[PDB]
Amino acid sequence: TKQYKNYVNGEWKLSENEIKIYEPASGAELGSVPAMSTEEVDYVYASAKKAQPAWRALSYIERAAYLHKVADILMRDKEKIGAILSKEVAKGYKSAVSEVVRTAEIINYAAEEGLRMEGEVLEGGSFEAASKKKIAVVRREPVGLVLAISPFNYPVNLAGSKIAPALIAGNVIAFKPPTQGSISGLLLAEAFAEAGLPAGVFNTITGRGSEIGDYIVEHQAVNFINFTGSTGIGERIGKMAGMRPIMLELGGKDSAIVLEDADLELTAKNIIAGAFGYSGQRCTAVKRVLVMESVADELVEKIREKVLALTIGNPEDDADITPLIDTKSADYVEGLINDANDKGATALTEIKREGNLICPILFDKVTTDMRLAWEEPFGPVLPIIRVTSVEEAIEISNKSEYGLQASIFTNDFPRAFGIAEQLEVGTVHINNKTQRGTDNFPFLGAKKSGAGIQGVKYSIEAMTTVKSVVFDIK
Amino acid sequence: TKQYKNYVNGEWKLSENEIKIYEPASGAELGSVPAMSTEEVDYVYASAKKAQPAWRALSYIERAAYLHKVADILMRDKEKIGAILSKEVAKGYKSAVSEVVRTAEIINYAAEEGLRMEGEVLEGGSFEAASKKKIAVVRREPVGLVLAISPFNYPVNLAGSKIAPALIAGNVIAFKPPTQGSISGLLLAEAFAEAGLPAGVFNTITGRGSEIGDYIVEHQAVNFINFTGSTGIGERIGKMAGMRPIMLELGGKDSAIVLEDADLELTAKNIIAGAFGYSGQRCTAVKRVLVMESVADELVEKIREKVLALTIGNPEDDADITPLIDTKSADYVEGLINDANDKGATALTEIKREGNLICPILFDKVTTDMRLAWEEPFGPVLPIIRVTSVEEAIEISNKSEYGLQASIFTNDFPRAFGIAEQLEVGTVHINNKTQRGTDNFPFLGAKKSGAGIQGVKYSIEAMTTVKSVVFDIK
Amino acid sequence: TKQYKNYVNGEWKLSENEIKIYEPASGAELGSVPAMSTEEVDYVYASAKKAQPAWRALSYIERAAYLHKVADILMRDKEKIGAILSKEVAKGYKSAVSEVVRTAEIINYAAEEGLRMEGEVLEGGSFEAASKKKIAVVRREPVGLVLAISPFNYPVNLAGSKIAPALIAGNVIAFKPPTQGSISGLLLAEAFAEAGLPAGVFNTITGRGSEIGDYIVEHQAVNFINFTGSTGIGERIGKMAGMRPIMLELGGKDSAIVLEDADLELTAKNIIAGAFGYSGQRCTAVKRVLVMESVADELVEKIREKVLALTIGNPEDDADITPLIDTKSADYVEGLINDANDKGATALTEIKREGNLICPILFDKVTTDMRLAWEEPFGPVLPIIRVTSVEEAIEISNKSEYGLQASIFTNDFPRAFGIAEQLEVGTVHINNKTQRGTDNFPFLGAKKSGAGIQGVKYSIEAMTTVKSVVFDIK
Amino acid sequence: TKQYKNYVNGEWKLSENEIKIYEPASGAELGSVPAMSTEEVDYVYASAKKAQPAWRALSYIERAAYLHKVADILMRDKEKIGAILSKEVAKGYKSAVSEVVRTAEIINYAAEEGLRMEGEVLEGGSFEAASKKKIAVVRREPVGLVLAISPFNYPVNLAGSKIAPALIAGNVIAFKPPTQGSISGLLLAEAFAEAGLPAGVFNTITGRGSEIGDYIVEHQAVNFINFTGSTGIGERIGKMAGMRPIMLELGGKDSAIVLEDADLELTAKNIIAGAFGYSGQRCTAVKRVLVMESVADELVEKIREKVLALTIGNPEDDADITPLIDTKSADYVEGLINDANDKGATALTEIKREGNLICPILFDKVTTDMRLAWEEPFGPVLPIIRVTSVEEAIEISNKSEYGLQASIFTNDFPRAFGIAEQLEVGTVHINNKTQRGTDNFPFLGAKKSGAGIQGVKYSIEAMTTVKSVVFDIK
C-alpha cells in the first residue's frame, strides 16, 4: 500500500503498525499512516525540547524566512495536495485547493505579524513617588513546546493557523492531524521538510485515540495545547491541561436573527451559503433561523427554492452537497431529522439518503421542544424558528450552551449594535452570514464554544508569555 | 479700579500700564488687567525655563496630585468664577458655571491619563539577523516650555485643555488668555497659585497684540505653541513657529447633510441646538444645512418654529441668544445678512439688532454664490442650501476651505460610513449635531481648520517627544 | 462572642453555625465568622448573577466613583482595621496599617485604569483585497461572575487587587477570604457596604473547606476563579476550573544570584530585607542564595551580623520576626531546620523556638541534596548555596519547580540581561530584592508558581473578554 | 550624451533644458538629467492628485504587493545600480551596492508594517455617564500628496525610507532627488515603472534650485514635505510649509562621551568607524569626543594609530576615505582645519589635500573657542575635547544647537541611563557609535537637528491622519 511516514527530528519514520485510510465518497483505499506508540511520542517531544533553545536563539527575521518558504512550496503544489485532500475528507476539488491557498496566506501573514513583536517600558513613579527611578523593561517570550491538533473539515488550514503563529514566536511544534485527514496533514509536513527548518522544531504525530489520545495531552513536555474539534473532547482537554494554557475551538449553533425591516433576498442568499457550505460540516455556520413572524412565510419560500438549486454529488464534480465524513455521522443527522419530522415540523424539501449522502433539507415550524432546535447536527439540515419579538429572539439565542457567532439581518444599525451587546457570542455579523472571515480579525466563542481568542495576532499573544526586567536609574 | 495682576514666578505682579475691561452686555467696567512689556515677557520665560528641570524631576504621581488640587479649588469657587466669566464674555450664567466645572473635569482626566505614560522596547532582529542582540528602550519626554493661548468663547475651558495635558508630562507653562476674557483667565490662575505648584512652572501673560503679539510666539524660549482662535492668526503662528511643533484649532463651517430617509424632528432639534448655542459663537457648530430637496420644505418649517422659541436677552437671565462679543462682530454678521437678503435668499425670521444683540435668523434658498454659504459668521444666522443628490452634497461640503466636523442625518448607516470616508473633516457625527463632545475623543480639523490632533490623550502625545536608548545584550 | 456576619445581597447575614478565630500570638479569641452551607453559597451566586446586567449597564465613570468611595472609607478607618488585622494574622501593627493603605491605592488605580478601556477597528483589506469594505469593531466585555480568594499573609491587600480590577470592568464579585483572616476580610466588606454599591454586585463567603471548598469553585455560576495560596490547592483549582479562565499565584523559591563583581553591602541589605520580611511568610521573597565561591565568605558574614540585629517578638511591638501563623507551620519549618543541620549544613545563628515563634536562622554550606535547598518553608530560615560559575547558578535555579521571580547582583548589566533571558521566572530584579513592587508592573510566575499575568492593567485584561461586530461599508 | 528622463504620469519625459552630471572623483561626465520648468512641476502634481483617489481605494494588500515587486527588481539590478551610484557621489562600490540592498529591505518592511494599520474604538462613558451609549470608531487615513526630497550621501536609501511609508498608507508621491545624485534617483524610478504602479501615483522631479526650489514646496497641491538635507534649507522649508505637516532630518554634531571606566579599545574602534565612514559625510556620525582627562592620552593614541590604517583613494577601490562631494565642500573643511591649527590644536596626522581628496585627520587639545568644536564639517576631521567631570561633558554637549544622537562609553549602566536623560538628543547609544541602525527603531533629533519622528512605523503614523465616526447605540 502507499505507506506514509511521520516527520520526526528531521527524518521520515514508519511505525511497526499502521492505519489504512479510505475515501468517504467511494470507499477506495487512499493509503496508510503510522499508528504510533507512546514511546514514539516520547521521542518526538524529546527531540522538540532539545531543538527549542537554538530555535529561540535565531532572529525573528530568520524564522519568518523559513515560514515564507513553506508557503511558497504549498502554493507550488496546491493542485497536487488539493487532489488528495479532496478525496480524503470528501471536500469538493476546487474547495480543497482553496484550503491549501488559504493555508499559505495565513502562514505568510503570521510570519510578518510575529516579527513585529514589541514590549513595553513602565514607570515606577506612576504608582509611587518613592519608586520614580525604577522602570520595567518587558519583552515577550515563547511558552515552549506547543501541541497543535487540527480537525477533519479543515485538516490543513486549521493546522497552519496554529503552527505558523507558534513557530514565529520561538516555540517548537508537535502536530497531530485527525486520523481521517492524516495523509493531508503529512502532505503539509513535506513542505516544512523541504523548507529546511532545523531538526526537531517541527514534528508530526499519528495514531489511535485509545493508545495516544490522553497521553499526548497529559505529557509534561507539552506547554500549550491548541485544539479544534468536539465540545466533549475539548472539555476533557481543558481538565487534562491542569493549569497549563490552552486554546480551544469547539461546537456551534449560530443563529441568524431576522427582523421585520430586513432585506429578505440578501438574507435568504446569505443563510443558504452559510448553512449548506461543505454539507453543514462547519462550526461557524448558520444553524438556526430566528425570524419575526410577519416576514417568516416570505423568507422561507426564498430559502426553499434556493435549496433546490444546490448541486448534490461527488467531490470531483465540485457538488455543493457531498457525502458526509462517515456512517456514524449520517446516522446521527438522520436521527435528528426523524425527531423533528415525528414531532410536527414541516419539511419543505425531500428526505433522502443514499450511502452517506444526505440531500439538503429545510425544516419549518421548529419548536424549542425539538432536538434540532439545540443540537449541532453537522449535516445539511436547517431549522426555522418563528418569534414574535426581538426580546424573545435574544432569549432563545442565549438559551443555547454554544456561543461562537451570530448574524442580525436588519436596516437599523444602532439597534443592531444594542442587540449585539446582549448576544452571548464572540462575533456578530450585521447583514451577513457567520464566518471566520479575514484571519486577521479576532475569532472566539462564548460558553461551551471554546476558550481563548484566536485570529493571527491574538494567537501569537496567546502562545507567548512575558519577561520583566526591573532596575533603578542612577 | 479693581486691578488684576499676573502670576509670575510665584508672585502676583502689576505692570506700569493696564487695560480696562468692560461687560459686552452692559458696557459697565469689570476691572483691569496688566499691559505687559516685552521685557516682562522675557522674565516669565526665564523663570519657566529655570523651573522646568526640577519639575520634570518630580514623579508623575506628584504632578497629578497638584493638578487634582487645582480642580478641587475650581469646583469650590465655580459660582464665584462663573459670575465674572458670565459678565466678561456675555455668556449665560448657568453656562458660565458649566464651563468652570468642565475645566475641572478635563484637568482631573489629564492628570490620570498622563500618569499612565509608557514606552516601548523594540527588537533589532525584526529587521536584521545580525542585530538580534540589539534592543531599543524608548521613553516619552516633555518638549520644554509650552505657550498656551485660549479663545474668548471658552477663555477658561480651552485653557485648561492645553495646560493640564502639558503640565502632567513635565513641560512648564506660560498662559496667554484673550484680552476680552483675561480677568477670567487670571481667576483660573488663582487656583494654580493656591494649589502651591513650584515657582515658575505656571505663569500668565496679558497685554496688547501690537506690543507682544508676535513677540510671545517668536521667542526662542518657546518649544511648542498651542492655540485656539482665528484662521488668519493661526496661519501666521504656523509660519512664525518655523520648524517648532504646534497645535491649532481654527475656523469652521460645519455642514449638516440631511438625506431623504432622515428623522426630521430629531434632525430639526439637533440643528437648532448646534447652530444657535452661545449665539453661534462656536467653531464646532452647524453652520450650513445641505438637505435633499424632497424633504427640505418640511425640515425648514420645524426649524423655523423652533427658532421662534429661543429666548433673547441678558446673560444674567440665561437667555439662549445673548449680545455678541463686540460691535465689530455684530457689524460683520450684519453685512452677511444684507448680502444674502439682497441676493434673493428667503429670511424666515425677522432681521433685528439693538446694540450688539442680533435676534436669531433662518435663511432659506441660499446659493453657493452668496457669502453666507461659505463665510464663518460667528453670529445667530443659519443658511439652508438645497441639493438633488448625495454626490452634490459631498461636493459642496468639501468645496469649503474649512474641515472641522460634519453631521449626517439618515437611517442607512453603511451608506453614512461611506459618505463619512469622503468628507474632508476630522469628525463625523451620525444623527447628532457636531461638538467637541467627550474630551477623551480625538478632536481635529482638516484643511484650514487646524493642525494637530487634540483630545486629552492626543494632546499629551503631541506635547511630548521620545528618547531612545540603544544597547547590545551579552 | 463578637459575632461577625457575611454581606450578602445588600444584607448582613449570620449562619446557623460559626467558626471562632483566635490570635496567633496570644491565643486570645478575636470573635467569630459564619460557617456557610452550600445552600447559602447558592444564594450568594444567584444574587450576583441577578445584579450583573444592571451593573454592566452603568457607565465606567459611575463604577469608578463607587470604587473611589470604598478607598476613601478604608483610608479613614485604617487604624481601626489595621488594629484587628495585626492581631488576626500576627503581623506587626504598622505593617498591618500599611496593607490597608496599599489596598486603597490599588483600588483607586484600578478604577482609573479600567475607565480607560478601549477597543480596536480592524481592516479586511489587510488580509484580502476582496474584503476591503469589511471592518471589525472590537470592544471589551466582562466575563460575568468572578470568584476571588485571598491568602492569610495579605487577606485584605490581595483581595482588593482582584476585586477592584474585576468590578470596574463590569463583573460581579463573590469574595472568599482565608478562614484565618476572615474577620479582616469582613472588615473590608463594610467599606463596600458603606459606599452603597447596588445589592448583589459585591458579596462575601466564609466557611469550612471540607464543606464548601470544592463547591464554590465547581459551581456553574462562576465564570472566573482568581486565587492566591498553595501550589497543591492551585493545581486542584485549575483542574476543577475545566476550560474556564483562571488566575493563580502559587508558591515560590526565589533565588538571589550573586556574581564576583557585586556590591556586597547592598547585596547583604537587600537579601536580609527580602528574606525575613513578615518572618519569611511571603511568596515573593529571597528563599535561596546562589553565590560565587570567591565572594561567599564575605557576604555570609555581613548577612550573619544583620540577622542578629532583627527584632523578635509581638505584633504590637512591631517586631521584625513575629510568631508564625499556626503550630502546623512552625512544625514544618522545624523539620526543614533539622534536615539541614543533621545533613551537615552550618548554622550561623541559634536554633530556638518558643510557642510558634521561631528565631531567624542563617544556614551556610547548603547542598542540593538537602530539603531546604528546594522546599518553600514559609518561615525565618535562609540557605546559602555556593557555586563556581554563572552557568552552574543558572542550572540550579531553573532546576526548581517554582519560577516566580529572581534577583541578580552584579555591575555588568548587558551580562545581567543575558542571564535574565535564561532564567525561568516572571520577573528579574537587578541589584534589588524580589517584590510585587509597583502594582502597575506585571506580576506572574513560571512553571508551578502560577497561571496568568497580574498587575492592575493585566488583571483587567484577564477578567474581560472581547465582542467583535463585523459589517460592510457601502 | 546619455540623456536621462523623468517618470511622469506613466511616461518618461525629457525637458527642453538639461543638466550635465560629472563624477566627483574623476571629473568625467556621467550623463544628464532634465531641468524642469514650473509648468512641468504643475503637471506632475496635477497627475498625482488625479490618481490619488483610486490609489487610496485599493486594499492595503494590493499596495504592499506593488512595493514588494519594486524591492525584488532593485535586488536584481543592485550591481547595475550600485555601479552608477558609486560614481555619481564618489561612494565606494561595495558600499554603493549596500545602499541599494538596504533600500530594498526598508521598502519590504514598510509594505508589511503598513498593511497592519488599525484604529481604535473609544467609550463615551469613560468621561461622562450621560454619554455611555456613544462610541467613536477611529480609522487612519492618508494626508494626500507627499513631496519627498532625498540627500546626496544616500540619494536612493533616504528616498525609499520616505516613499514606501507614504505609498502603503494611500498617499501619492512626487520624488525630488539631489541634483548630484539625480541619475541614481532616476534609476530607482525605473524599478517603480517596471513594477507597474498606476499612472500618476509615483512621479519624479529634477531641476535647478533657483527655478523650482521654493516652487515645489510652496505649491498648494503638496500636503506633506519629507526632507533630508542642510539645517538652513530645513528651517526655510518649515516656514514655507505654513501649518502643513513636515518631516525634517537636518545637521548633527554627535558627541561621544567617554568616562574613566570605559573600555578604551572598544571605544577607539567605534569612534574610528563612526567618525570616518564615507569620509565624515554623514549626519549621524561621531563628530566630537568629550573624554575625561585621566584616560584621554591613552584613547588618543589608539585613535591616532587606527586613523593611519584607513585606506585613501578611489571609489572603485573601495577606499575608506574617498574624494569629497565637491570643491566648495573641501574648501570649507579646509577652513576649519586652519582655524583649529592656527588657534593651538594639536594635529596628530598630516594635513594633505590633492584635488578634493582630504586625508583623514585627528585633532587633539580642541577648545570650545574653536570653530571645529561646534560646526558640522562633513569631512574626515575629528576633534578631541578633554573634560574634568561628567557634569562638564553634559554642559558642553547640550550647549550645541544640534541634537541628533549621542554615545556614552562606560561600564556603569544605571549612571549611563541617568546621563542619557539629561542629554538633549533623540537617541543615545551605550558603548557603541551613533547610527540610524535598525530602521524599525525611532529616528529623530532635538533642537536644530530636525522635526518629526522617523523610523518605519513612525514615518507611517506621521504621513497619515485620523478619521473619527461617532454614533449612539440603541
Domains and CATH numbers, chain B: 1-250+450-473 (3.40.605.10), 253-445 (3.40.309.10)
Give CA–CA dist A5/C232, Å, rounded.
41
Identify the bridge partners of residue D149 per DSSP, sorted by sequence position. Answer: D176, D227
- Residues 168-227, chain C, touching B (beta carbon < 8 A): none
Helical pair D157-168 and D182-194, crossing angle rounded to 10 deg:
40
**3-class DSSP state of C160:** helix
Q: How many CB pairs under 8 A join A and D?
A: 30
Does D469 sit within 8 Å of B123, measured CB to CB? no
Q: Determine what percent of chain C falls in helix, strand and coil, rounding each to the nearest 5.
A: 45, 25, 35
Give CA–CA dist A99/A158, Å, rounded.
9
Q: Which three cell numbers stand for residue C458?
A: 493585566
Residue among C56, C401, C64, C350 nearest C231 (CA): C401
How far B66 CA lies from chain C's nearest CA (Å)? Answer: 17
Minimal Cα distance from C473: which residue of B? B414
State the sign of the Cα–Cα–Cα–Cα dihedral B183, B184, B189, B193: positive
Of the candidates D58, D118, D128, the beta carbon closest to that of C120 is on: D118
E strands within B335-448? 346-347, 353-354, 357-358, 361-364, 381-387, 402-403, 405-409, 427-430, 446-447
Residue D395 φ/ψ, nearest 5 degrees: -65, -45
Does D113 sit within 8 Å of A414, measured CB to CB? no
Residue among C298, C299, C225, C264 nearest C462 (CA): C225
State the sign of the Cα–Cα–Cα–Cα dihedral B258, B263, B264, B267: negative
DSSP symbol at A361: E
Give, in order, the Cα–Cα distances in Å from A282 to each of A152, A160, A402, A434, B5.
10, 17, 14, 11, 75
How far D391 CA lies from chain B's nearest CA (Å)? Answer: 15
Q: Is D421 on the interface with A (CB under 8 A)?
A: yes
Structure determined by: X-ray
Contacts of A125 in chain D (CB under 8 A): none
State the sign of the Cα–Cα–Cα–Cα dihedral A451, A452, A456, A459: negative
Contact C274, C308 (CB under 8 A): no
Q: Is A471 on the interface with C (CB under 8 A)?
A: yes
Query: Where is D174: in which H helix or E strand?
Result: strand D172-176
**A391 Cβ neighbours under 8 A, 6+ residues apart:** none
How far A316 CA lies from chain B's nearest CA (Å)? Answer: 40
- Chains with 3+ CB–CB pairs under 8 A to D are A, B, C
Contact C71, C168 (CB under 8 A): no
Task: Decide the pairing of beta strands B246-249 and B450-451.
Answer: antiparallel
Q: Is B301 on the interface with D (CB under 8 A)?
A: no
Give CA–CA dist A58/B99, Å, rounded.
58
CA angle D8, D11, D13 (to 5 degrees): 70
Contact B295, B262 (CB under 8 A): yes
Residue among C470, B413, B412, C119 nearest A406 (CA): C470
Q: Is C431 on the interface with A (CB under 8 A)?
A: yes
How far A438 CA lies from chain C's nearest CA (Å)? Answer: 6
Residue A152 φ/ψ, nearest 5 degrees: -75, -30
- Chains with 3+ CB–CB pairs under 8 A to A are B, C, D
Helical pair B60-76 and B157-169, crossing angle rounded to 10 deg:
160
Q: Is D10 on the interface with B (CB under 8 A)?
A: no
Helices then strands, each counted (H, E), chain C: 14, 24
Give CA–CA dist D186/D193, Å, rounded.
10
Q: Which three cell numbers stand for residue B386?
A: 438645497
E strands within B24-110? 29-34
**B378 Cβ neighbours under 8 A, 6+ residues apart:** B280, B281, B324, B329, B332, B333
Q: How many CB atoms lie within 10 A of CB A28?
A: 8
Q: Is C53 on the interface with A (CB under 8 A)?
A: no
Q: Is C127 on the interface with B (CB under 8 A)?
A: no
Q: How many CB atoms lie within 10 A of CB C195?
A: 18
The one catalytic residue in C40, C113, C190, C249 is C249
C-alpha R_g of chain D: 24
Helical pair C413-422 and C390-398, crossing angle rounded to 10 deg:
30
Give CA–CA dist D179/D48, Å, rounded.
22
Resolution in A: 2.5
Of the candidates D116, D119, D125, the beta carbon closest to that of C61 is on: D125
Contact A51, A173 (CB under 8 A): no
Is D243 annotated to bind a ligand? Reply is yes
Report H helices in C147-289.
157-169, 182-195, 209-218, 231-241, 264-276
Identify the bridge partners of residue B20 per DSSP, sorted by sequence position. Answer: B32
Q: Is C401 on the interface with A (CB under 8 A)?
A: no
Minimal Cα distance from A221: which residue of C? C447
**D328 Cβ neighbours under 8 A, 6+ residues apart:** none
Q: Which three cell numbers stand for residue A37?
A: 506508540
Look up B128 and say whether it is catalytic.
no
Q: Which three cell numbers stand for residue C340?
A: 539541614
Contacts of D446 in chain B (CB under 8 A): 465
Task: Decide the pairing of beta strands D119-123 and C119-123.
Answer: antiparallel
End-to-end CA distance of chain A: 72
Of the candidates A415, A440, A472, the beta carbon closest to that of D474 is on: A415
**3-class DSSP state of B218:** helix
Contacts of B471 in chain C (CB under 8 A): 414
Give CA–CA dist A205/A41, Å, rounded.
7
**A273 Cβ neighbours under 8 A, 6+ residues apart:** A433
Query: Where is D182: in which H helix or E strand?
Result: helix D182-194
Contact C465, C141 (CB under 8 A): yes
Q: Is C135 on the interface with A (CB under 8 A)?
A: no
C-alpha R_g of chain A: 24
Q: How many CB atoms lie within 10 A of CB D149?
A: 23
DSSP symbol at C198: P
Contact B421, D467 (CB under 8 A): yes
Contacts of A122 in chain B (CB under 8 A): 118
CA angle B253, B258, B264 (to 5 degrees): 120
Q: Is A344 on the interface with D (CB under 8 A)?
A: no
Query: Where is A214: in which H helix or E strand?
Result: helix A209-218
**3-class DSSP state of B175:** strand
Q: How many CB pairs under 8 A join B and C?
A: 30
Minimal Cα distance from B415: which residue of C? C474
Name the CA dihedral angle for C418, C420, C422, C425, rounded to a multiple of 10 degrees: -170
Does C417 sit within 8 Å of A441, measured CB to CB? no
